[PDB]
Amino acid sequence: SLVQLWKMIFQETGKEAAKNYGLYGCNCGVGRRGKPKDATDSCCYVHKCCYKKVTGCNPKMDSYSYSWKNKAIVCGEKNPPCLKQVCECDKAVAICLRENLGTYNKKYTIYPKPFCKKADTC
């Protein structure tokens, strides 16, 4: 669920997830999609697009089972198809988030999403 993702974000980024990425760019956090602003927003772009490949669940409400191993995210204990995927979706968006931390814009942290150009289809 979305609380798990928020934790997941913090554990690889060290920043409070909703505080820093809840309104970042045009695809991070609540709201729709847009043409991404930077690599930080674009990995939120990838997250929302793997989130549409979910089938039988509510990712923002349904929790899953996962653990935080030797600084490595292991969702890999047996999970139902969706709950496996969203959590892998969350881990992938948690992992890339650490990969573009040097790019993070402090001005994009709360971004006016309506003004962003509409994203294509994933």
Numbering used by the authors: 1 to 122
Verbatim from the authors:
Phospholipase A2 (PLA2, EC 3.1.1.4) is one of the representative toxic components of snake venom. Group II PLA2s are further categorized into several subgroups based on the amino acid at position 49. In contrast, Lys49-PLA2 lacks phospholipase activity, or exhibits minimal phospholipase activity because the catalytic Asp49 is substituted for Lys4–6.
The crystal structure of PflLys49-PLA2 BPII was determined at a resolution of 2.57 Å. The asymmetric unit contained four molecules of PflLys49-PLA2 BPII. These four molecules were superimposed well relative to each other with root-mean-square-deviation (r.m.s.d.) values less than 0.5 Å for the Cα-atoms. The relative orientation between molecules A and B was similar to that between molecules C and D. However, this dimer was superimposed neither on the conventional dimer nor the alternative dimer previously reported. Furthermore, basic residues were located on both sides of the interface, and the surface charges of both interfaces were positive. The area of the interface among four molecules was less than 350 Å2. Based on these observations, we concluded that the conserved relative orientation between molecules is merely preferable packing in the crystal and PflLys49-PLA2 BPII does not form any oligomers in the crystal. However, all cysteine residues formed intramolecular disulfide bonds in the crystal structure, and thus, intermolecular disulfide bond formation is highly unlikely. PflLys49-PLA2 BPII harbors seven intramolecular disulfide bonds, thus 12% of the total 122 amino acids (14 Cys residues) contributes to covalent bond formation.
